[PDB]
Symmetry: D2
Subunit: 249 residues, 4 copies
């Protein structure tokens, strides 16, 4: 349909929003490449998705893994139309308890990997290709024990505005999807390892949403597909936020 | 995507409203367009075809609004989608602003938007989508356009509170803010000199970072996306298609 | 005494934030002129303010009242170094219950008055004069049944960004103060005639602020004095929010 | 005198905006401690400021330098009332030319050092202490070849919103100053080594400002002084932008 004939790569495709985005992009008819750190899970994701989804095992923090993955696309498909940098990390640390490792790992995966994934992608990307970055409402709001996560997402959003000018001659457009609270394994885990703890956190976050329900990952994926499509041609550097109104009110 | 959904676009005759109605019809929505002048409306509705229906209407009159929504109730009986595109723009610098240069602009951009939604609301079912006409001028500053820009900023603000008003309804309010889109109105500002319209459009085209005025179809696709159910989790948000002009 | 020797006009000086502001501009030594909804109250406020403050009561919705007040300042002082437009109205109406007059009143008073108060004021204001607009955090956020009030404030803030371009040859600078919840007769009356209604609302609103404390009107005034003072010389078109962090998180 | 009886620390105090802030903070009567990377430059600053300003050479990226410096504050002054994080780095790299070292250096100094500078300070800071972070308009806008610098400054602002909640029990308030273009050696150095190259660049940057003039460093400093002062008591998590209207338009 809309994405017919388009090659799309999603880093952090194995689970959650990346998995749902890969599903939705394939349904629209894109060839989808997804990246996972661990081979067994990546294979399970590729099998479940089907529909011409291809898995490459990679760590976005490792510079060499990025070169290999982009080499596979160039060998297999010959171009990259859509890039969604979904690979991300999050942990709770309040000020006064923040370790050097908690900062570095967060910024390495959430911010540093995004820059180098995008830089390496560009030679493959044609004029009119579309890039989507994984922002969060955490980038614009304040949450206790989430300062490092939110600052990394805010840094991600800003990258888009300056990159608009850098990519201008290329003709590639970069935009940001910022999800509100979305039902995913990662969100549930924050509630703890006990099922009753996961339910409690999920219920509390749902109350915070104005409409009162956590997002389904498919609802986030549709935003990326719209951004991936030619319909988004005039959009550049913009932030599209699906929060149920949480960040808007 | 829009098949089986009733959609009303005010200011349908030209520009984005014309482009928006065309796109919603292509997606399969029942489309009703509002026009100030019948000859423009009748010629517009004929060009659209595709089961497009045209009602003449002036938003600044409650009467014209009341009549139009009664027709929707009789014919379709529910509005799935609402786009308020009817808008006015004039240049007034501080020291040049008339009391009614303000009054006309804020009627049309803001007051007509408030009432159009209020009269539309009873027809709208649970899960319906409302899209408002924001502008990048609402978020930025341009010399002699304070009155236009301030009205659009009010347009954007309405959605945030209207999310809370409409929560029990299940209706969702979102704002589209276009950048410079080629339009008779964008040309109007250059003047009725052929060089004045052309010289202006090239100047605004230089202003956009990509270096091109939007085609109205590019703005239209955004409203349809908000119109579609894919936007189910979007509420109270502003989506801007400016080519990055407001983003940088 | 940074604002010593400066003439300042405050609309809505009689009550709440305008009264506290008038006190603070007077403390630095500015000449302060305040406006009154009604003579009785305006006389009481000037007596409370002392310190050579003069009150002219006029209605901002009326151009003639503006011309009269603007003539008195030029005759009495003949200069307007600092302008604070605090005169404003706020009422609660949910969508589906909003009257034609309620939108018209709120918008005429909060928005229409600002344009005309500022436009007529300008001949008195010298190069380097500072203007402050009355924004609110309600302008950037959404609260149930307050759509018309917030939209009006958003219109106020937008004016400043375009007005900097108009006023550049002027040398006048426009900046916006957006208060968070501040204890005022206007805030309390919202709870109701009953003290309980007033007390219950104030305690509930206090909880919403992250610091958990309702603002004193002087705390908003000190921000207005800072914008009024020469220290704010490089700030232009900006919005400064003293909200207790409410809109920030 | 308003900051009299307040202990203030400014990192990156030796030059430019940090130097001016130290001068203004000292003028209000705060005891001022400044940090410099280079001892010779730091000593000249400490000599010039006078008024009992104390200098500690320190590289904020090094955790040990931070521990040493705060140890001196606890031994000498015994508390820190005001903290302004001015230490910062800026370089130009366009997308497709961004090295890993250019990314790491910017984020270590602009973002990571800020987190740990603030974290180590907290035991010293009493209830009612004020923290100011160095935002930039680059965080809110996009400029070609400045994606990393802008992303780091955007992350700096985001920390404040979450730190509002983290520090609420502490009674400390966190706010961000975001300067527009300010005439400084670093802005000049960036345009060209040559003075002729610098004049055109400074003149060009001046044109971008709506008022049409680059800021003096003292104009930025007054905002930090206001934020340092008790007048900003209700402000929390807010960003104050002194750009001459550049980002506001």
């Amino acid at each position: 349909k809309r994405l017919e004939g388009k090659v799309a790569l999603v880093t952090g495709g194995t689970s959650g929003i990346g998995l749902a985005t890969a599903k939705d992009l394939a349904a629209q008819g894109a060839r989808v490449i997804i990246t996972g750190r661990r081979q067994a899970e990546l294979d399970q994701a590729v099998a479940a998705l089907g529909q011409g989804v291809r898995g490459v095992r990679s760590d976005v923090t490792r510079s060499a893994d990025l070169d290999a993955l982009f080499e596979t696309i160039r060998a297999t498909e010959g171009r990259l139309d859509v890039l969604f940098t979904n690979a991300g990390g999050g942990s709770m640390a309040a000020l006064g308890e923040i370790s050097e490792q908690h900062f570095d790992d967060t910024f390495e995966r959430n911010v540093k990997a995004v820059v180098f994934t995008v830089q390496k992608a560009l030679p493959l990307m044609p004029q009119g290709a579309s890039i989507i970055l994984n922002g969060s409402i955490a980038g614009s709001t304040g949450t206790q024990a989430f300062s490092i996560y939110g600052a990394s997402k805010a840094a991600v959003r800003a990258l888009a505005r300056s990159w608009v000018l850098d990519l201008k001659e290329r003709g590639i457009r970069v935009n940001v999807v910022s999800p509100g609270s979305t039902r995913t394994i990662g969100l549930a885990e924050l509630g703890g390892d006990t099922q009753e703890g996961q339910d409690g956190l999920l219920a509390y976050l749902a109350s915070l949403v104005p409409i009162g329900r956590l997002a389904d990952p498919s609802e986030i994926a549709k935003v990326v597909s719209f951004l991936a499509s030619d319909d988004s041609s005039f959009i550049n550097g913009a932030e599209i936020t699906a929060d149920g109104g949480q960040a808007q009110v």
